[PDB]
Amino acid sequence: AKTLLHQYWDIPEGTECHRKTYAATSIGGASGLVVSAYSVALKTPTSFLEGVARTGRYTFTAAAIGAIFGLTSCISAQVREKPDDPLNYLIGGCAGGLTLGARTRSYGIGAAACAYMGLTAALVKMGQLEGWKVFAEPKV
Template sequence: MSLFTYKYYDTPEGQDIYKKVFVTTKYATLAGLAGATFDVLMFSHPKGIVNTTGRYMFYVGPLVGMAAAFTVTANVAQNIRGKNDGVNYFLGGAAAGTILSAWTRSLTIALPAACVLGAAALVKKAAVDEGWVIMPTLPTNATKTIQSVRHDWTMVKDIDSLKTWTTGSK
């Protein structure tokens, strides 16, 4: 299986940790790039390539670290404990919370961030185990594509009897 087509839950917990770290950090990198682009364009307006790169690294670096810390902690806890339960995910979320508090340089949010991210990880674990759908997929015919102009997206069709205009030349 290719590394680029691998999904996090393709293998059981505790196996293929490097592939799982790649998957989670890939999504964290994309989220960090989006957030950093928003910051650079809307708020910070850095001057020069070095400052712009610094702003991107300010967002991407900690998010990638949080994703890697979650993945490694949850999977290593699975291997050490030998149980596949929510405690592993809570520990992973707590590890990500400590990185979040280091990123914000605030010791006062260390415990709340660890608890909140641990609880979010518990919800994710319960969703995976019980088959909950957190982010439903849209039906393919509901999205607009380059071919959308060929479809009639109106709510009501035109009534020909109400058209009172003519098309032009006499």
């Protein structure tokens, strides 16, 4: 799931909504699948049906988060005519936080998820623009 990040970043910001939406949806689906698999491995499911219900709930929730965040970031980048702006990713992160709060049946959690996911997406744009490297190769 490394090349999926490249395919997400190969599409320019605020140019084509569809492929960015499916790339973000696939990223969310993969993340939800990893989280659900670890939850099933660590927390023993009651049965097969409840286990796949929890897996489907986590996977569909994370896929919806990814699709909403990507769609909102793309429409904000189109409506501001500025791909090189962290405001679009902030708005997309808040939309993802609102969707997560609506899925979790909460509103304070939704506002906190708005704030934190918007800040995280803003920092993702910061690293994309200024070339921040958290996984830096040994240089000296």
